[PDB]
């Protein structure tokens, strides 16, 4: 496991142990988006505006149809536990596509009920309706409370132009979502107490189940996470400060987050997770396997830590650690017990660890801070694993090796001659 | 050309041959955006709001002017076929800048007509006008149908506040576009039967031709693609599944798309293309030259295929291929003719290819599927080209080589001493 104390001596600071919650299961609910609003048949107003709006919808529902059809074509008995799902189609489908296809076979039993509700949704003037399966008609609330009043108040031709503007606004917001798809977008259009669980729920991708090109309807499966806290799992953030080697600034280029699961130690790719104050909520395990030298470094064999040169000011030169300061006092003006007493670190030491046992007040570049009395902050280190991050640099040093290798081969040829 | 059958044996699955259409020519049309709306001179309402709106416009039209001026300064007889275009200016201009500059010399003959229409657009209250060259006045439809009615209905001071809000909304949507520029954005502001040809047209970049800082106008050249289907051109998607080497998971890191043009075989960077159901529509040829080992691998010399370690679950472990399954049955529980009969692949085999001649029902991790009877799915392989994707890993292994190289040189020195 992580040896946090030794890693400080190479400027590697491991902090903020947070737990992890994974959405190992999902509860599914269905949403029917009915994109054409209903205008009262008594007046026939807005027909031309709906015709133009329909022409815009084709530019996003037809691409959705093509994608869903491609998923349905992966699989050409069923309805029995442990039965066969279907026949493999002629083509190629990766595991991601097979899972998507299998999910649609599971949703098939719902589609036969949704196809009944669609007949009721057609003639209905309601904006939101539930039969559970929820159905929404795009602009229908605005039509009921703005356009239908207008047709009496202002006459048919003036009110049609008001509908056209509303429909074109709705098309612009539809394009942002459908032009995977997260619940956050759908919830934005149509408007447990942990805020972070709510935020994570909107992060989950919705699954398209049907795209009806006749009635301009999209059926979506909404997935609600069931969150389970994994035991013996800790995610740490790690920061590296500059490390002095003969008056040149180096640092250990470790990944931004690391993870432990008992004896396993690896990185964490939390880019898809929601970071709460005390835990990460992730759709799946973010762990990945580290380079052998990085894993060995983190396990406390700090001689193995890879090091690279500091190219910019993004790398911090100092940090607070456990009530004291860990800093590169060559490039940072470390000061002890008053702004005049500079702490000098010898050229062969990489970072200075300053504790309350040595300084009551520590000044970093003039900033005076008191050390913490309850702080728990506590040899020759040679870091041979010099590393370059930039492909040009690696290529340049590879050319030097090849040049030296050709020279080595020549000595063999001449030496073989005298032999 | 691609040897799809052999590549399956290294877990490389080549699928979905799609054609390619390129926009080799463009038809140009001109659009004048007149950013200041006209308020009826009888009342002088809105003058103060327009002044504030003008001050906001400077923050985006002055940067456009500076960029356009920079393009016009590349070139300081003409009007004859095969004549000189102009004199090279004192400066530096890359081939991209020369093309932009030459395009402006071609548009010169249009500017002398656009400068006549600008005089009519000034006093006119029309929102869209054509003289073809199209001209649009920013908020003019709203001004005609909302603000001018208001000034009688509610008086001058109340209606000014309504204009100010409208202008600020238009500024926000102008900033998203102008703060290259695609026609999709312009079409969003101002509201053949193949949908994918329409989507590609909106993908094309508009060209700014003039920025008038006196009348607050932008002139744009809209380019309409002429699409031509290239013969003997096929674009394939390729997916790599995990490959077993002594109970460790490897894969071939091939590019996401590959392309053939007769004998030429290379990659395709379709990131700018529109993927239709049967072809890709691209602004220019997406092909790029592959590494010699990747081209040889794809040509069926599968011993040459580069291989890298599986670091995450993104790499699929199994796929459907031509009516059967290609999978790494070490880490995947492959099952034949019933969930109890596990398929065992030997440790020296990378992937298992399961066909209808061997299994009627194939189970992947419990998921039972029937094999396809009309499926067309059909030696020691040593993959020596081990490859690392991460610069740290390359640097670490380069240090080991250099360390071994210094040791080799020492043996030469002592051997030369005894000789």
């Amino acid at each position, epitope marked *: 496991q992580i040896d946090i104390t030794k890693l400080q001596h190479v400027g590697v600071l491991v902090n903020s142990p947070k737990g992890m919650k994974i959405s*190992q*299961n*999902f*509860e*599914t609910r269905y949403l029917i988006l009915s994109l054409i609003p209903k205008i009262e048949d008594s007046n026939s107003c807005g027909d031309q505006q709906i015709k133009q709006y329909k022409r815009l919808l084709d530019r996003l529902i037809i691409p959705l149809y093509d994608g869903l059809r491609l998923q349905k074509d992966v699989i050409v*008995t*069923e*309805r*029995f*536990f*442990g*039965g*066969v*799902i279907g026949t493999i189609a002629l083509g190629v489908a990766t595991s991601a596509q097979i*899972t998507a296809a*299998v*999910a649609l*076979v*599971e*949703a*098939k*039993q*719902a589609r036969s009920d949704i196809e009944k509700l669609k007949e009721a949704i057609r003639d209905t003037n309601k904006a939101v309706q539930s039969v559970l399966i929820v159905a929404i008609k795009s602009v229908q609330d605005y039509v009921n409370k703005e356009i239908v009043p207008c047709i009496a108040r202002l006459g048919c031709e003036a009110c049609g132009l008001l509908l056209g503007l509303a429909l074109d606004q709705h098309y612009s917001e539809l394009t942002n979502i459908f032009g995977g798809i997260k619940l956050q977008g759908i919830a934005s259009l149509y408007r447990k107490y942990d805020i972070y669980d709510l935020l994570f729920t909107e992060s989950i991708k919705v699954r398209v189940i049907d795209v009806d090109l006749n009635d301009y309807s999209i059926t979506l499966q909404v*997935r609600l996470p*069931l969150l389970t806290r994994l035991l013996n799992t800790q995610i740490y953030k790690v920061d590296s400060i500059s490390y002095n080697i003969q008056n040149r600034e180096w640092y250990i280029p470790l990944p931004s987050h690391i993870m432990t699961k008992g004896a396993f130690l690896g990185g964490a790719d939390v880019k898809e997770c929601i970071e709460a104050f005390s835990s990460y909520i992730c759709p799946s395990d973010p762990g990945f396997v580290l380079n052998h030298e990085m894993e060995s470094c983190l396990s406390g064999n700090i001689s193995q830590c890879p090091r690279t040169t500091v190219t910019s000011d993004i790398v911090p030169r100092y940090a607070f650690v456990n009530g004291g300061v860990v800093a590169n006092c060559i490039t940072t003006t470390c000061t002890c017990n008053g702004i005049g007493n500079r702490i000098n670190q010898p050229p062969d030491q990489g970072v200075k660890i300053i504790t309350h046992k040595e300084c009551n007040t520590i000044g970093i570049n003039g900033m005076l801070f008191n050390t913490n009395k309850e702080g728990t902050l506590a040899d020759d280190i040679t870091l041979n694993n010099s590393v370059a991050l930039n492909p040009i640099d690696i290529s340049i040093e590879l050319n030097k090796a090849k040049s030296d290798l050709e020279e080595s081969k020549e000595w063999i040829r001449r030496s073989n001659q005298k032999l | 050309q691609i040897d799809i059958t052999k590549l399956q044996h290294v877990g490389v699955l080549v699928n979905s041959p799609k054609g390619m259409k390129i926009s080799q020519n463009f038809e140009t049309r001109y659009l004048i955006l007149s950013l200041i709306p006209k308020i009826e001179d009888s009342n002088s309402c809105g003058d103060q709001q327009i002044k504030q709106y003008k001050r906001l416009l400077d923050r985006l039209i002055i940067p456009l002017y500076d960029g356009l001026r920079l393009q016009k300064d590349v070139i300081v007889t003409e009007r004859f076929f095969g004549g000189v275009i102009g004199t090279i200016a004192l400066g530096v201009a890359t081939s991209a800048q020369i093309t932009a500059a030459v395009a402006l010399v071609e548009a010169k003959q249009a500017r002398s007509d656009i400068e006549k229409l600008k005089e009519a657009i000034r006093d006119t209250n029309k929102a869209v006008q054509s003289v073809l060259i199209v001209a649009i006045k920013s908020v003019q439809d709203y001004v005609n149908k909302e603000i001018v009615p208001c000034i009688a209905r509610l008086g001058c001071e109340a209606c000014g506040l309504l204009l100010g809000l409208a202008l600020d909304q238009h500024y926000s949507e102008l900033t998203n576009i102008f703060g290259g520029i695609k026609l999709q954005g312009i079409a969003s502001l101002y509201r053949k039967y193949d949908i994918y040809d329409l989507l590609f047209t909106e993908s094309i970049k508009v060209r700014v031709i003039d920025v008038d800082l006196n009348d607050y106008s932008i002139t744009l050249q809209v380019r309409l693609p002429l699409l031509t289907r290239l013969l003997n051109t096929q674009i394939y998607k390729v997916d790599s599944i995990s490959y077993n080497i002594q109970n460790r998971e490897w894969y071939i890191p091939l590019p996401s798309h590959i392309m053939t043009k007769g004998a030429f075989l290379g990659g395709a960077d379709v990131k700018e293309c529109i993927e239709a159901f049967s072809s890709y529509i691209c602004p220019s040829d997406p092909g790029f030259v592959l590494n010699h080992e990747m081209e040889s691998c794809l040509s069926g010399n599968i011993s040459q295929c580069p291989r890298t370690t599986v670091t995450s679950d993104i790499v699929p472990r199994y796929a459907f291929v031509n009516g059967g399954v290609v999978a790494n049955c070490i880490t995947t529980t492959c099952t034949c003719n019933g*969930i*109890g009969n596990r398929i065992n692949q030997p440790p020296d085999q990378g992937v298992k290819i399961i066909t209808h001649k061997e299994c009627n029902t194939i189970g992947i*991790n*419990g*998921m*039972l599927f029937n094999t396809n009877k009309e499926g067309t799915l059909a030696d020691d392989i040593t993959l020596n080209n081990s490859v690392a994707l991460n610069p740290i890993d390359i640097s670490i292994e380069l240090n080991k080589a250099k360390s071994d190289l210094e040791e080799s040189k020492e043996w030469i020195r002592r051997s030369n001493q005894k000789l």
Partner: nanobody
Amino acid sequence: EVQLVESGGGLVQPGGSLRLSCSASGSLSTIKALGWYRRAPGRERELVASITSAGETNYADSAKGRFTVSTDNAKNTVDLRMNSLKPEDTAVYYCYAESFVLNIYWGQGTQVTVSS
């Protein structure tokens, strides 16, 4: 979806036995595991037993060796035999179905109450 319908709840004397049953209908060829969940009053759901399509079976620590789970696939039924009913075992019991794509489906819940 999958529809689950429990039966066999009721009152029972402690130390006795009870046999819960749950019927499933739907795309059951997509269901990875069937089993039973527990909530005691005022606390979260807990696993009791689950069985895979292959018959591989697992149990909560309280269930280990104490309960048995079984299925009949030709009629899509799931059964849990309760035996040596302890006073703590009174709870609402839900049958569940878990899809290969990680979807979870729940029954209405049936209550087992054990006498004092």
